[PDB]
Amino acid sequence: ELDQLRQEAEQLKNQIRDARKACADATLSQITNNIDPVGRIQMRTRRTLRGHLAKIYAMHWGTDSRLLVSASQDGKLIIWDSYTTNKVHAIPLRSSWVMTCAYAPSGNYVACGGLDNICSIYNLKTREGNVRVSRELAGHTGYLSCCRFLDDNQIVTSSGDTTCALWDIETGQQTTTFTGHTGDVMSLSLAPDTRLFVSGACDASAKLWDVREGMCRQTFTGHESDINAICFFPNGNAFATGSDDATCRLFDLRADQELMTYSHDNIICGITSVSFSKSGRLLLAGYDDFNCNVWDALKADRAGVLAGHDNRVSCLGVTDDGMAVATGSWDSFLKIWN
Amino acid sequence: CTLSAEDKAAVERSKMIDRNLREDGEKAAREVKLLLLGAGESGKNTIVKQMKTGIVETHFTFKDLHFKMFDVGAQRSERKKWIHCFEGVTAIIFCVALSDYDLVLAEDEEMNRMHESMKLFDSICNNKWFTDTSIILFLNKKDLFEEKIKKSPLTICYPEYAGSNTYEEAAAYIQCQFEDLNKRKDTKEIYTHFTCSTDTKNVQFVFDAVTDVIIKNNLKDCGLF
C-alpha cells in the first residue's frame, strides 16, 4: 500500500527526530558562554582586482594561496596573482554563462561551467603556452551550480538537475552519481578527508554523500528556503550552510542535528556564499545587501562587516594559509582583505 | 622600480592581457542581447529558423547590427536561480501561440495552454531583474488562429469575452489582455507583432524594437531622458 509506505516514511522521520532530541541534551550557546569573544575585527581592501566587465559569479583560491581564479559572464576565466595584481592567465570561455570555477589542488588544471551544462577542464601547464580545454564533461541535464576537484583525475559536479556526480576526467565519464536530493543542488564542499562531502539543494536541505560507496549517510534539514552555499569546518566533522532565509546554519556530522543558526533582524536577503577561517572561529558569508558579514562560530554574535562592494557579493574564499579573505561581488571587482 | 626583469616582463604580459580584455569588452558592448522565452511549443524553433545542452546560443548581424539570442527552453530547472544571469539583456523575446487556447497542456486538461502562457508572462514581465527591460512579444500561429477561430469561440478560454469571431477583434482582445499583465507601464514597453511562416520582416520588427530600446537607453545615458 502506497499509504502504508508514506506512513512508514513518517514513522522513520519521527524516529530520526526523536533520536536527535535524545542525542541533544544541551545547545552550543550555553557551552561556550564563558569564553572570551573575538571582538571587533576589520579587514581592509588590500588589493583590488580589475579587468572583469560582467558580474563575478565564482572565485577559487589556489593551493599555495598566491594564485586565484575568477569567473564572470563576460566569458573570461581570469587567473590572477594576489600580491602583484597581474593576470597570469585569461581564458576565453565558449559559454559566457558561468556560475562555477575551481582550482585543482595541483594547480595544473582549472574547472569552469554554468548554463552550458558542461564542465570544462582546462590544462594550464602545457608546451604550447596556451590554456586549452583539457576535457569537456557532459551529462548533467541542468546547469552546473558548483564543482570541486577531488584530484587531477576525479571531480565532483553539483547541478540543477537535482543530482551530484563524480567524474573521471581522463575517461570523460561519470563514475558515480549522487541522487535523491529533491531540489536543485546549488553548492558542494569536499572535506579535508576528500572522501565525504556535503551538498545543499533548493529543496531546503543538505546531504552528506560519500565518494567511494556513493550513498548519502546523513540528511540535514532546518532551513526555511533554498540553500545557496555550503562549506566544511576545517576539522571535518562540522559544516556550515548559507541559505536564502538570511540564516547560516552550522551542523555537526556526528550529532546529525543543527548545532546553531546565525541571523539578525537587519539582514533579510539571501546568502550567496559561505566560508570558514583556518581555525574555524570565524564564518564569512556574502549577502545580497552588498556587504560580507563575519560571524563568530562559537558565539552567534557577528564579529564584523566587510563592506566596500557596491553590488551583490557573489563569492567568498579564504586562503589555505588563512592569511587573506577574498570577496568577489557582482560589481566586477574582487577584493582581498586582511 | 624595485622589480626584477622577470617581474617587469610579467607586468608587461598583464598589460597585454588587459588590452585584450578591453578590446573584447568593446566588442561585446557593440552587441545586442535578446533572451528568447517560448511557453512550450510557441513557434520558438520556427522563428529561430526564420532569422537564420542547457542553453542554445545564436548570433546574427542585420544591417551592421549584431544580435546574440539566448534560448533557455531546455533548462527545465528552477528559473529563480538562473533568470538573474540575463539581467542587462537588450530585450526579451516572448513567444505566445494563439492556436493554443483550444489545446490543453500535456499535464491533463485542467489548465489551458494560454493560461500557462499568461502566468509565465506575468512572472517574467514583472520579475525584479527585468524591471526596466523591454519585451518584444511575438504572437505566433496567426494563420492557424485565422483558419481555426470559427470552430471554437474565444469565450471558452476567456469567459468574459463577447465579440465577433473575426481574426482582428480576437487578436486585439488577446494583445490588450497580454499588455494588461504589465504591472508597471512607465518603465518598460511591449512590442506586439503577428508572424507566420511566409513573412520575412519579423526580424525587421525585432530591429525596430531594439533600435527603440537603444535610443531609450542612450537618452537615459546622454541626459535627454
Epitope: 594564485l67 596573482d81 594547480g107 608546451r127 604550447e128 | 626584477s4 626583469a5 616582463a9 604580459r13
Partner: single-chain antibody, 232 residues
Framework: VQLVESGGGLVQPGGSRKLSCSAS????????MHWVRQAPEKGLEWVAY????????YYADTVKGRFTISRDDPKNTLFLQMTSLRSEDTAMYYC??????????????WGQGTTLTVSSSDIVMTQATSSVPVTPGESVSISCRSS???????????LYWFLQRPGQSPQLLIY???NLASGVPDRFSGSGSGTAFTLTISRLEAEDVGVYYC?????????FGAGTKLEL
Amino acid sequence: VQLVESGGGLVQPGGSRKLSCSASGFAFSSFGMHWVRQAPEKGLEWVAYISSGSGTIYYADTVKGRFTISRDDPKNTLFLQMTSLRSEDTAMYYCVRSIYYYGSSPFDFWGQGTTLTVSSSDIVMTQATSSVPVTPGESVSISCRSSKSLLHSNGNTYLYWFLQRPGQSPQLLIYRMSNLASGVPDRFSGSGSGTAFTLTISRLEAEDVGVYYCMQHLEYPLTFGAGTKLEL
C-alpha cells in the same frame, strides 16, 4: 615545439645580414624571444631579447646599436638584423624562447642553431671548477659563484642551469635555484645561498655528460657561466 633558425655561412668582414628563426607548435605571440650566441670555443653569451608584443627590445652592452631584432607575429618569425660584423662575432647563434609569469619556466626551449663566420657594473659569473672528472652513478656537485647577490626582496633568486650535450642545443635544468625543468630527470637538483649555487647530480649517466652553464636573470644584460665540462 621547434625553433628552426636559418642563415649563417661565411661573410666578409664589416658586412650586414639578417638571421632568421622560424617557430612552430606554440603561441609565438605569447612567448618572448632571445638570440644567444656561442663562440667556437667559448661559452654562450646573450645577444638580443624581444618581449611579447615587441614592448622591449634589449641588447647586450657590447653589441648595442649595431644589432637589431624584430618579430613577425602573423607569420610567427623572428629576425635579427646585423651590421658591420667583426671577428668577435664569429659564433653559433641560438634561438631561445621564454615566458614570464608566476611559476613560468623561462629559457625552457632552445633552437637547433645557426653558424656564422666572419673573416679577419655587470654581474660577474665564475664557474671556478671548469673541469671535473666524473664517474657514472656517483653524485657530482658543480658550483657557480656570482659577483652580487642574486636574491631579490620578492623572495626569488634568479639562477638558471643549462646542460649541453655535445653537438646538441643547450637544455634547461633548474630555474630559480630550485625548480626542476619539466621533462628533466630528478637526478639533477639545485641549492644556493645567494652568492654561490650548486647543481647536484645523484647518479651520473651517459646523458649527463656535457657542459653546464649558469645564468643570472636579475639585471637585464644576461651574463653566462664559463662552462663546467664533464669528463668521464
